[PDB]
Structure 1
Amino acid sequence: RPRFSFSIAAREGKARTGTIEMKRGVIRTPAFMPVGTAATVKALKPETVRATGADIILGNTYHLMLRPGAERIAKLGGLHSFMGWDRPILTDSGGYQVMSLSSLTKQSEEGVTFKSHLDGSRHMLSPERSIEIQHLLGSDIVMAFDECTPYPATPSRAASSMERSMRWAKRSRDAFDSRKEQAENAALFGIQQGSVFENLRQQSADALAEIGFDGYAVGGLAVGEGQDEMFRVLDFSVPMLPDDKPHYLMGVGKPDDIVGAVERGIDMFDCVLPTRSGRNGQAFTWDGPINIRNARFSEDLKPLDSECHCAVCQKWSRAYIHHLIRAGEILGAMLMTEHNIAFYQQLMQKIRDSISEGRFSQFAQDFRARYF
């Protein structure tokens, strides 16, 4: 396969369905990427993640540079080898989690200096270091290092962050290209910023396209603005990005958000929702999510979802998983997670098929009628 090749097979309105070919595998889009936090998709062996239908997973750069270490993972043969996942891996830049999880973050034009929320150590993450860490990890899709703008943002602050992000996008591009091995085997995605302001999003899109990237992510969303606002922003933002390249909506995972995002042109998604779902009792079903911990499921012999085809719904009942979760049993987490990720992948398959068949709009309608 080629280093990177995105092809759209079918369309319906703004929605697209196709594939991304990379050296390590083919990615069917719209795609959902399970998140591997500390070099592991929570409570799941990589073979199980693949069994759910996943073509690609996301790796958190922030956690990896801290815990085992980027250099260490490289010495061990790369993240793929390390965790046992031989398919594509998209890695975030680490920046977003630096601003969310780390201590004493000192920001500058050069990058960001911060303290670990673990050992209390110190690191100087920058566009160059982030690209380098992602290289050390052996990432297939590398995200440009940016600065996520907090919501709500004033036009002036949103402009400054976006402008800095565009400058950092150029530095990310150059860092990526100067590393021969990485440029020849991996892909690079740029990230659009501009908060909720149309003019800023347009300037960001133009700057990104001018630099040139393999894919374009819509950043700065799913940060407290609500679905209506997110959709309103996506309405004008997605059309600004190059049509022939993948559109990636970062940190978006509620089923209804994904459906609406695909209707607006998004091809890729990632979220912790599925993994953190079965950690509190939340299991997704076609009739809406349910909290397995509720007493009404103590003697329910039916599977988590009536039509889901995952191994969990084939083999175990709600009653058993209810008991497992309430007992604080690890198997409870394993089973809940497998089902949830499988549910998401089935959602992505239903989306891809409906687009390919020109009945996506009807699917979106039927999905919402039942889900809500």
Structure 2
Amino acid sequence: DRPRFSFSIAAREGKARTGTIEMKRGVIRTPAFMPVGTAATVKAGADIILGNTYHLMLRPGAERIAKLGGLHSFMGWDRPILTDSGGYQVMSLSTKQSEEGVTFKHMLSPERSIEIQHLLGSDIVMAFDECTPYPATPSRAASSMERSMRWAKRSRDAFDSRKEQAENAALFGIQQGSVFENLRQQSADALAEIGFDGYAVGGLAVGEGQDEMFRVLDFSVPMLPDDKPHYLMGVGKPDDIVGAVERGIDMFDLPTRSGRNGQAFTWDGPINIRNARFSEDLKPLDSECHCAVCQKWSRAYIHHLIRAGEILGAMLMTEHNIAFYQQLMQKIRDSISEGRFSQFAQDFRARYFAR
């Protein structure tokens, strides 16, 4: 049987890595994109899907999901599932913060977050953190990061207390520190002292823009343990993914939101399929994409469906977008393994931004 958790790096190019995470429910090829499980009928394709902790804890509630057999049974997905810890979502969508946790309209603490994720049955559990708002002053970023590190220890202890969770799931710690190198270093040191199965870069994709995000990744990723997976939370567009892989990121969580609003991803950049220019375009959404939508239907027909208000149009767009992202990740993995990722990144950008 597969181990609870084992990350192996098969090949490297610069800071980029490709490899595998083995878990009891399956193997995850990295760099990996992790789609939302409810977006479409995701097929095994993705190696791991996201569960929506924040939504599930409100409807139907984590206790009810456990009564129904856990998220794997509920969603019909027998492979790994990753869940976020819920605080990012509470702070973005719902609040009163304290050292105990976050109260909102009802108290979410590290201990409760870990128990919710246990009741959902997820395989990769995120520590309960605070995503510091951007911009943040050095003092506020430090105080926030320090609280997150105390919460990371409480998350570790709560996870270790639940035998089924400790023996079958994995726990990731989340680095904070805003855009400040010294705080990112203190956060990395604190997380490594606690010890986690993987390490996330939190506190980005919060409005800072790509140049600043890449600058922060430049110094932040090397601070994390090299032999553990690196998960960049909340990122992102295809070009953000490529640049983050170039900086040592292994896992990523737009393709669903875009698919419901008329935006399709292609190797020549995004297109808004509702635009009249596509009304007579017989080409598939993307000229090279191998997905079932591009094998069968034209831009003109998908344009027609979406303009007519047919839900089928949005579903076909979403299926194409998820498949496009998975083809992107496969090309990334293959190019790193083959030692041609630098060339791939250059070729990708030249075509994606030529439009």
Distance (Å, rounded) in 1 between the aligned partners of 2:139 and 2:54: 28
CA contact (8 A) 1:34 1:57 kept: yes
Distance (Å, rounded) in 1 between the aligned partners of 2:163 and 2:292: 43
Distance (Å, rounded) in 2 between the aligned partners of 1:302 and 1:359: 29
Distance (Å, rounded) in 1 between the aligned partners of 2:26 and 2:181: 36
CA contact (8 A) 1:310 1:339 kept: yes
Gaps of 5+ in 2: none
Three-state SS of the structure 2 residue aligned to 1:352 is helix
Distance (Å, rounded) in 2 between the aligned partners of 1:112 and 1:276: 27
Distance (Å, rounded) in 2 between the aligned partners of 1:72 and 1:281: 35
CA contact (8 A) 1:281 1:293 kept: yes
Three-state SS of the structure 2 residue aligned to 1:36 is coil
Residues 92-150 of structure 1: per-residue CA shift (max 9 Å, x gap): 001101001116xx1100001101xxxxxxx1100000000000000000000001100
Distance (Å, rounded) in 2 between the aligned partners of 1:39 and 1:360: 30
CA contact (8 A) 2:4 2:24 kept: yes
Aligned positions of 1:1-372 closer than 5 A: 1-36=2-37, 53-102=45-94, 106-115=96-105, 123-270=106-253, 273-372=254-353
Indicate how the Cα distance of structure 1 residues 221 and 156 shifts in structure 2: closer, same or farther if over 3 A, else same: same
Distance (Å, rounded) in 1 between the aligned partners of 2:102 and 2:264: 37
Query: TM (normalized to structure 2)?
Result: 0.97
Distance (Å, rounded) in 2 between the aligned partners of 1:231 and 1:365: 16
Shift in Å at residue 71 of structure 1? 0.3
Distance (Å, rounded) in 1 between the aligned partners of 2:6 and 2:111: 25
Three-state SS of the structure 2 residue aligned to 1:42 is coil
Distance (Å, rounded) in 2 between the aligned partners of 1:73 and 1:332: 31
Query: TM (normalized to structure 1)?
Result: 0.93
* RMSD between aligned residues: 1.6
**Runs of 4+ residues over 4 Å off in structure 1:** 37-43
CA contact (8 A) 1:189 1:214 kept: yes
Shift in Å at residue 301 of structure 1? 1.1
CA contact (8 A) 1:39 1:59 kept: no
Indicate how the Cα distance of structure 1 residues 42 and 62 shifts in structure 2: closer, same or farther if over 3 A, else same: farther
Distance (Å, rounded) in 2 between the aligned partners of 1:11 and 1:288: 27
Shift in Å at residue 36 of structure 1? 3.2
CA contact (8 A) 1:98 1:114 kept: yes
Distance (Å, rounded) in 1 between the aligned partners of 2:194 and 2:236: 29
CA contact (8 A) 2:40 2:318 kept: no
Distance (Å, rounded) in 2 between the aligned partners of 1:168 and 1:56: 26
Shift in Å at residue 39 of structure 1? 10
Shift in Å at residue 253 of structure 1? 1.5
Three-state SS of the structure 2 residue aligned to 1:82 is helix
